[PDB]
Design a protein around this ligand. Structure first.
Ligand SMILES: Cc1cc2nc3c(=O)[nH]c(=O)nc-3n(C[C@H](O)[C@H](O)[C@H](O)COP(=O)(O)OP(=O)(O)OC[C@H]3O[C@@H](n4cnc5c(N)ncnc54)[C@H](O)[C@@H]3O)c2cc1C
Length: 257
């Protein structure tokens, strides 16, 4: 420790028995780029117990936010799930990751394709002025299994458009496309199935992906990332990196341990 900032919990919200969000203080020195992750967790017997977490908060916010799984036997989240306001967490000081605008070639459309907690980095990006300066449209796809897992659905649809700074850009440029596999909902099925049938493009009112206009960031389950990568690679889209801008970038929302 002392390669960590101590932050205090300010707010906690449980979406379901497996998903919760919380907000903390943010150190004055803590700088990041929208889409980056850090190591977050708890001081346990005077040593760090930390996991990779996407920063879900805006870089414009005087606070941090995390959108977290709750795993009953998971070493970190078995404890993290019981957090209360005024509890302390630790956050590493060196943000990293691939979900960055400069890893993509300039374009017209940015598709943020997520499952489950993979929404987290995109909650930072849709609350960044810079994404709306760079992209005419931002399409946020969030795929989940149950309606109650659509964390932030009322925030994104109703509260974000009234944001005093970003409200008008979100109204004009953000298209939010939630989908639910295992419960009745206006939009059903896996985002991979919705690309393959063309229903994604019909429903959001934009053309089929093309090499000129469309860029993607992928953050989701190992199955969704493998299937969506193959879809995009076989259509002739290239994976970006710091060393060579591309049309799409990938980050694991988690690893099957
Ligand atoms: C780059 C990166 C970014 C990440 N960002 C986040 C984030 O923003 N929010 C988040 O909750 N986790 C995130 N994770 C996963 C995270 O690092 C931990 O795995 C998670 O905190 C649970 O840790 P644990 O010690 O309780 O259980 P672990 O021992 O890490 O995992 C136990 C099992 O739970 C499942 N699991 C773990 N994380 C998830 C998850 N997010 N969704 C579904 N199943 C999961 C897997 O089946 C895993 O095999 C990220 C991982 C990576 C590699």
């Amino acid at each position: 420790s002392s390669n960590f900032n101590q932050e205090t919990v300010t707010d906690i919200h449980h979406w379901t028995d497996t998903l919760f969000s919380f907000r903390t203080t943010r150190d004055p020195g803590f700088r990041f780029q929208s889409g980056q992750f850090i190591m977050m967790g708890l001081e346990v017997n005077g040593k760090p117990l930390t996991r990779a977490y996407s920063i879900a908060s805006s870089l414009y916010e005087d606070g941090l936010e995390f959108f977290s799984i709750k795993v009953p036997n998971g070493p970190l989240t078995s404890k993290l799930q019981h957090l209360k306001k005024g509890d302390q967490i630790i956050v590493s000081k060196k943000p990293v990751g691939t979900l960055l605008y400069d890893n993509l070639k300039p374009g017209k459309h940015l598709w943020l394709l997520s499952t489950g907690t993979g929404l987290a980095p995109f909650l930072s990006i849709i609350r960044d002025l810079e994404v709306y300066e760079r992209f005419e449209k931002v399409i946020l796809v969030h795929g989940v299994r149950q309606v109650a897992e659509l964390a932030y659905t009322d925030f994104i649809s109703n509260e974000l458009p009234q944001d005093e700074f970003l409200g008008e850009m979100v109204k004009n440029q953000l298209i939010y496309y939630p989908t639910v596999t295992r419960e009745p909902y206006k939009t059903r099925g896996r985002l991979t199935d919705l690309i393959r049938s063309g229903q994604l493009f019909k429903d959001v009112g934009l053309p089929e992906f093309n090499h000129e206009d469309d860029r993607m960031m992928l953050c989701g389950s190992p199955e969704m990332l493998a299937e969506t990568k193959q879809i995009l690679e076989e259509r002739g889209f290239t994976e970006g990196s710091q060393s060579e801008p591309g049309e799409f970038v990938i980050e694991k929302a988690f690893v099957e341990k």
